[PDB]
Design a protein around this ligand. Structure first.
Ligand code: NA
Lengths: 203, 155, 155, 211
């Protein structure tokens, strides 16, 4: 559950470097993190994560220092479930131990959903073409409201209507094995977020 | 006051109509939270341009600073809100106001790679040479992030 | 010259490398076509920001006018090129230059509904009152096209 | 092709008014046009259409004045086939007889393609209850079908589904039941170098679901 968060944290880090990034997986949790260079005297006790939700007083969240593969230092904080109410604004603040600013943001729990990668991707060739079938991401609610996207490598990327977990690829260049992968996102009305990681590729 | 706190909550939530109601009821347009952030601080961070215009029309301090020294121009610059940067600039925001790290909105915009905000700030009268507490200029931050397009502008 | 025509042709096609090569070969950065449009005119019309920056640093006239009186700031304003408007302004473009129709870049931007460009021009020092040959101001164009957001700024 | 160009001209006029609009149909032609209010002394001889392509000198194209259904006056010019080369930039300029500017643009023939409407739209009730299968043909006399993207519209309000390029059939997920649905499909050029605008809608068809 932490090796996947490791992959999830590295996923968002590529899109928004130098930012504070938050995401939820089950709509009851929230994990915020950021990445910076290692400093000699600075650890998790040199920054202060504070959040304020609804009219409850400003609460403090515990920061955790962990290294990344790219050499940077990742600081992350996991907000408790009791404070994760999905549809109200949540103010976040990261203040340096000197009093200086670092990050300040307002997010909505529902607007920052990062699902798991889909599993059990199976490709079988029926004459026409290849039909792809897969399972939804594990431990993810509201399957009927999950949008998918398939990737073909030789590249082609096809969108899948929410709810559907299978597709047929019409025209292809030849009977050679193509590499397929699928990723999932949260659809609508109020929900939104980021593309999940790719599934285990198949040929 | 009770109304002053609800004005901040309404600006954070991006509720345009509620802000107008609370203003007419006599709410302090510069009501501060525990961090001394005004409702203009939160509207700039959220990126609501209608509410920013309303608060400014009712006498909000465009150069208000919080505990950290962050002005509403810093928040609009970092989050990448091009219109609110321009609106605050026309209202009379200080391009060269710095926070506790000595970073002007030109520094924060340069770190996030917001090229147009960087160009807007220079046009408004930003000091390109100005350095933060660490001694790095806006040009020095672009070189560290590999933004060659940004670095050529700050020369 | 041989190179001068190839420089205009390269700027229209958006070929950054060829422009630098032709510049090193001694091509006139202000080489004009039949309409007296420079390569900076064409890079602004195409919306290529890399080439515009190259031409300007190589001695291109930022205030060059063609037969129609159109300056490159006019072209960046109409086509909705936010970055090139800022670059040309910092290079020293005349915000209040008009073409043969008497239209300033504030007129052209307001006609296309480019709200963000209009705020940039006002900050740079555009004359909101200025009228064209028809006698219409930048505000007068917004009311005719039903852009109430645009009109309130030019009030 | 001239009654269709009229419908095509009125089509694009709604999307991009107050500018000059160009489009090609078979990638060998090019027709540019714009619409403005009628003036007492103005005709096609008070404007000058000029284009420049590749390294050929600036050429003049003949303008034609024609009225529209909405009351405005449409000026159009059809570039000759010899001057329509698909993959190079084409500079366009419309100059008033006084010397004043009107339009100035740079376009690519391949990036501005307006296809015909699809034909033979058939709506069939899918064997799995609740679904509707739509089938159609590509626009007539149009090459390279594999690079044509489609989009389907469902009418009760509206619902619009995107269709991957090449595919000429789709399965509709949700239906309300005893209501009659109206379906229509339109096509445009997708990738890699080609592009343009959405064509007109196909001939609509109606189907009734059985709850
Ligand atoms: Na716009």
């Amino acid at each position: 559950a932490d090796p996947k968060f490791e992959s999830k944290a590295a996923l968002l880090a590529a899109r928004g470097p130098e930012e504070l990034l938050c995401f939820t997986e089950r709509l009851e949790d929230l994990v915020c993190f950021w990445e910076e260079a290692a400093s000699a005297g600075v650890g998790p006790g040199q920054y202060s994560f504070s959040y304020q939700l609804e009219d409850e007083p400003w609460k403090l969240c515990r920061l955790h220092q962990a290294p990344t593969a790219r050499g940077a230092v990742r600081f992350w904080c996991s907000l408790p479930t009791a404070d994760t109410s999905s549809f109200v604004p949540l103010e976040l603040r990261v203040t340096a131990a000197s009093g200086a600013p670092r990050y300040h943001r307002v997010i909505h729990i529902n607007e920052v959903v990062l699902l798991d990668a889909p599993v059990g991707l199976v490709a079988r060739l029926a004459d026409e073409h290849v039909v792809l079938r897969w399972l939804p991401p594990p431990e993810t609610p509201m399957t009927s409201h999950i949008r998918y996207e398939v990737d073909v490598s030789a590249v082609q990327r096809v969108e899948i209507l929410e709810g559907r977990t299978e597709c047929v690829l019409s025209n292809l260049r030849g009977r050679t094995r193509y590499t397929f992968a699928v990723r999932a996102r949260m659809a609508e009305p109020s929900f939104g977020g980021f593309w999940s990681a790719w599934s285990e590729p198949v040929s | 006051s009770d109304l002053g706190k609800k004005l901040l909550k309404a600006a954070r939530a991006g509720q345009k109509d509620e802000v107008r109601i609370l203003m007419a009821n006599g709410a302090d347009v510069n009501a501060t939270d525990i961090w001394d952030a005004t409702p203009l601080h939160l509207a700039a961070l959220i990126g609501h341009a209608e509410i920013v215009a309303v608060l400014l029309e009712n006498g909000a301090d465009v150069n208000a600073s919080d505990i950290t020294g962050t002005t509403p121009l810093h928040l609009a610059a970092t989050m990448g809100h091009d219109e609110i940067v321009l609106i605050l600039l026309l209202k009379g925001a200080d391009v060269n106001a710095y926070d506790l790290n000595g970073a002007t909105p030109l520094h924060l915009a340069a770190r996030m790679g917001h090229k147009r905000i960087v160009l807007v700030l220079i046009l408004a009268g930003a000091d390109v040479n100005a350095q933060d507490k660490f001694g790095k200029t806006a040009f020095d931050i672009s070189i560290d992030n590999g933004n060659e397009d940004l670095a050529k502008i700050l020369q």
